[PDB]
Amino acid sequence: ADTTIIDAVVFPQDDGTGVSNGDEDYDSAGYLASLARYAGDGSYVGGDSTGSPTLQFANIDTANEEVDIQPGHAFILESGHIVQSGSQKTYDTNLPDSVPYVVILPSSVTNVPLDTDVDNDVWLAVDPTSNDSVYIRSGNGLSAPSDPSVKLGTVNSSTGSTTRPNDLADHSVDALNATTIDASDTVTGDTVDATTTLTDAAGVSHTGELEDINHGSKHEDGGSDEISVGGLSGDLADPQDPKAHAASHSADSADEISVENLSTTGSADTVPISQGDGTLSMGSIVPTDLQWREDSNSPQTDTNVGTSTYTIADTFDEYLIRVQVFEESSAPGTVELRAEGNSQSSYDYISEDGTTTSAATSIPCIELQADSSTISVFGASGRFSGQWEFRSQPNTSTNLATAGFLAVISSPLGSLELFRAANNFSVTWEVFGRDIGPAGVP
Amino acid sequence: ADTTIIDAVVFPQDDGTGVSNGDEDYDSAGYLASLARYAGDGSYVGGDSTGSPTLQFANIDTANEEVDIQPGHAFILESGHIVQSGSQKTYDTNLPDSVPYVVILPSSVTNVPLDTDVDNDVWLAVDPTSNDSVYIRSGNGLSAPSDPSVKLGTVNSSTGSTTRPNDLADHSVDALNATTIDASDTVTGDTVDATTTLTDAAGVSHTGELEDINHGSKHEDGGSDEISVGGLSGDLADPQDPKAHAASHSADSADEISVENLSTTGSADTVPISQGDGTLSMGSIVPTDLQWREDSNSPQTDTNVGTSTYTIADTFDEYLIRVQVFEESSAPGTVELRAEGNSQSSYDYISEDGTTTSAATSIPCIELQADSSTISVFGASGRFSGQWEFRSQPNTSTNLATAGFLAVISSPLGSLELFRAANNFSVTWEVFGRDIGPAGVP
Amino acid sequence: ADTTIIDAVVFPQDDGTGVSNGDEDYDSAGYLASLARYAGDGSYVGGDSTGSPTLQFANIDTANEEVDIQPGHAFILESGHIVQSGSQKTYDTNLPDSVPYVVILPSSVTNVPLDTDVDNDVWLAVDPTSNDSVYIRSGNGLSAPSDPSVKLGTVNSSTGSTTRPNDLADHSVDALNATTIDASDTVTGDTVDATTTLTDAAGVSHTGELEDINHGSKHEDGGSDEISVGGLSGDLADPQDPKAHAASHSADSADEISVENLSTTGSADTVPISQGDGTLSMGSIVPTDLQWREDSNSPQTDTNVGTSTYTIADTFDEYLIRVQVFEESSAPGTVELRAEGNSQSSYDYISEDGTTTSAATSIPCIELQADSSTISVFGASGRFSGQWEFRSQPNTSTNLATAGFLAVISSPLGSLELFRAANNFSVTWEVFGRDIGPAGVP
Amino acid sequence: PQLGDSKLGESQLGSP
Ligand SMILES: [Mg+2]
Ligand SMILES: [Mg+2]
Ligand SMILES: [Mg+2]
Ligand SMILES: [Mg+2]
Ligand SMILES: [Mg+2]
Ligand SMILES: [Mg+2]
Ligand SMILES: [Mg+2]
Ligand SMILES: [Mg+2]
Ligand SMILES: [Mg+2]
Ligand SMILES: [Zn+2]
Ligand SMILES: [Zn+2]
């Protein structure tokens, strides 16, 4: 692994390095200037005036091996140099630490060999035996030089892939003071301290303090940075204080609390009665037994014989008739209840004391007198009582008659009739039904 | 554009730089020491031992042009030097890269000219023809030196404003290892890795991981960092499960649902009745027709003649008197319904069989009945319904007597009078009104 | 404060430094190379090729003073060197700024003295009077060298504790361009700018933008990064819109609103009546006065003599008996109410007009009438209201009979007997009670 | 001159 470079130069060299006595380098302004350029701590390929690495690869011909190396410079550390102590020309003193050569390449090296179609490691080697002796090693994983050297890079003759790790200075310092710092990859430290601004990868610039995980302590009531819940969705796992909503419960609205669902403490048969005073209370409303019920609140008649069909009621097993009568004071008499030939033929005719009365196809003498008189009816139809008077004020008045009388179903039904000879009655009836059947069942 | 500095020096220079064969710089310890101080990649103004830039501006006289430069050192790069290859004393080899001179100013340069009252660019220039030949260019945008030079800065002769971009080293490295790194401006990196601590601009030190935008996904239930909602303000856009609040709806509390607003499924006329058992049901309460109503629940009398105004009732078109009586068995009999001269003179007199009865300015022959023998009241005022007896046990008892009798309005009103000569009468009445008018309408 | 090192070397030195003309250093490659290694701005201990500080302490022997220094190199700045201006051999020109020496130690220095059992400062001093003249100061706060020196570190002879500030290069630059940057301590910048990635101390990598404090403004509805409240816990400080819950208020569910608690607008005595078609309304249900109430709804009889204890009513002060009857037309007659010898012997016997009837141990002739006649009943027990008739249709039929009759308590109780000679009798009764006491109070 | 064959500061760098 050799390519003895015809024109490379290395500096500096003495009897105290590996050269014979006659073969010490001659001094040049260019050598001192290029040596002064050293900056790193290790061995590295030098950068140009722009800050671009030199000794770069070009014209990688891949599997046909060959590659071009551009000119430039690199620094190579070597240990075991001897120096002259002070005024004594005798090379006498060993250096304790490794110290740099500059390697200057004035020409592009042309079509340097590699192994075919595989990975190769490239090394630049200085031979400390001459002013100038330089060679290159290459090969498929082939060994680095024993001699002072730098790993100029790696080229793969199959893929054409290249990397070079040693291509700018590793630098170790204590404190760095700078205007600006710009790293290609990582910036790292045990404390990154962004005074004035921190910019994230989204390009947002922050000044105020950032947020840690588990900051939920703050968003709650009475913590710093509380949130307003107005407008948010969901249901809370605890039920919430209900806002005013009485009106929503009404008869046909979205909420409908029907009364037959509600509680009451009240005893059986109690009813909510209003007390006035806005308030309900559990009272009891008790209807009577002995229930009587109306059918037809009977028509008026006046200045005329009573238009008597005062009941044409629905069937009730017992009817109670009640009358009010205004008068012909000049000619009172009977409120006739001779009736006529009703649907069934039951009537009885008995009076106040008279014990007997006469009968025909339409009745002879059943009367209800507009005069307090020995005149009554008692039968299956027609149980009567009591007799009124044709006056209040001795001549004329409205405030006159009443009677209460009743009949059973003998016929399933009946209307009731009337007459008065004098014509000039006026009359109102009431009629009410009650219900016990004609046998063993009401 | 020239100011040939009388005392400035430049190093290094030899036959391979631009100097004549004899005019090579004589070597000095100070030159080597100052040259070794080179550190950057470019051309820059050198720092003092403190880390402050040298060659500083002072005493800017503004519109009167002149300006002072303080002593110091700068590094100026030049290409195209020649060197001796190894032992061969002939200058024979060209350097591939630009390499530094040191420029040393031992004195302050005093009152250097500028153009009047405008911007000016300042350049320090080496003439590579002599050991020492140094000059300065200045002017209103006047052309930079063609000779090796550095842009020492810019000065405005109107404003006195100054900047200088080349005042410390640009430095390009591969890996920087440091203790502390402190930039006056930007620390940019394509990854910033704050191990141990990150401090923001507010001076808050974070160790735990920071929060991204769109972290709100976490604050919900069963997420990490869930928040308690207790005490937060606002209304949720969804309505919420209501807490226990039955009692709030009460008669005069905040919520108020009136019973007339509530639903029922019940049929017409149904009423909520308590079944006991805490529960309501929609049954029906049915009052009778043939309604009768009280006025004044009638007074007691005992050991005395009856306090006979047993009612002085409000107008009802019909009244129903009912009596309860305890009787003087030693002298029973007459229950003289004396009823003397009531407001209108309607009466009738008839007995239970006696057909006719006597009358006077006050009642001679109307009685209710202590001894169940024959008597009656029959008239527009006074319809009777049979008699009563003065004994339970054959001698004496309390458990004796009742009757039921009625009167119409003939007078619009009435109060009923009664007497007994025996004295030892005792009594309660009831009275109830009913309402059919004395004409064609109730 | 001295240890004149027998083998240390210093470079460079000329007449332009503190050496005589007999005593100028001889030039060596090793000196030039080691000098070019200078990089920092100040005076510092030089790093090895790894980037580790040289001239390290070893074998600190505590209160027995002695300490070992390992070989290496350090740089020491000195001011006030003189140089040759150009070609002139006369050392004539002052340097404006301080410039470095190299100090090379080829050997370990062994068991160097300190003060006993206290803190000590160690200083390495160049004596600029010879080619190689170097000495070390040490002592308990003993004065640093006057001569060009570096504070090599501090050792405490009591504790064995050591620190050293000057152990690598302080470096000040304008712009740093690097691949990777790594501080052992702080990174500081007036803007920290993480393109691509920021990593916190927890080792989480952020690309998206970070969160500021007071971000709570965003979490609310309509904001970016809204939170859904479903599942969260607590009570909101404002009451919430109540979700549908009508059914929860029911009789024996969790919420319980009893009807007696509720409002009504209704007047006194008003009751919620269902109108039908859902809505309740505040009508009034009015029971009548003149209240009558049942005890035992009477048994049927047919084809048989009356099973006559037809009711056994409780102690109401007045009973109202009502009858319904059917019988054989071959033998109608009396509904016998002769009864038996009752608990108390109250009777009266009066018929319609008959005025009188016979009395015995059991009754001779008290009757109720199948076929309308003079037959009637009046007494303390037993008041009557007339007679029915023996037919409906002329031939045998059910629809024959009713009557109403009443009695007081004479005995506190009673049950009523009956007989009918035809046998082929049939019946139903009603009974109702009414209360007024046999004295001055109901 | 060559390295080593001059005491420092008492010669100019290069060549005749
Ligand atoms: Mg030699
Ligand atoms: Mg080629
Ligand atoms: Mg050489
Ligand atoms: Mg010069
Ligand atoms: Mg010459
Ligand atoms: Mg001045
Ligand atoms: Mg000399
Ligand atoms: Mg030791
Ligand atoms: Mg020396
Ligand atoms: Zn949050
Ligand atoms: Zn509610």
Author numbering:
A (entry chain BG), B (entry chain BI), C (entry chain BH): 2 to 443
D (entry chain BE): 2 to 17
From the primary publication:
Here, we present the near-atomic resolution structure of Haloferax tailed virus 1 (HFTV1), an archaeal virus thriving in extreme salinity. Through single-particle analysis, we obtained near-atomic resolution maps of DNA-filled and empty virions, enabling us to assemble full atomic models of the virus pre- and post-DNA release, including all structural protein components. The full atomic structure revealed that the virus has a length of 1350 Å and an icosahedral head with a diameter of ~600 Å. The tail has a length of 560 Å and terminates into a baseplate with three radiating TFs of ~190 Å in length.
The BPH also anchors three TFs. Three TFPs come together to form a base, followed by a β-helix, a stalk, and a head. The TFs are connected to the N terminus of each BPH subunit and radiate away at a ~45°. This interaction is stabilized by extensive hydrogen bonds and Mg2+ ion coordination. A DynaMight analysis revealed that the TFs are highly flexible with respect to the BPH, likely aiding their ability to dock to the S-layer at the cell surface.
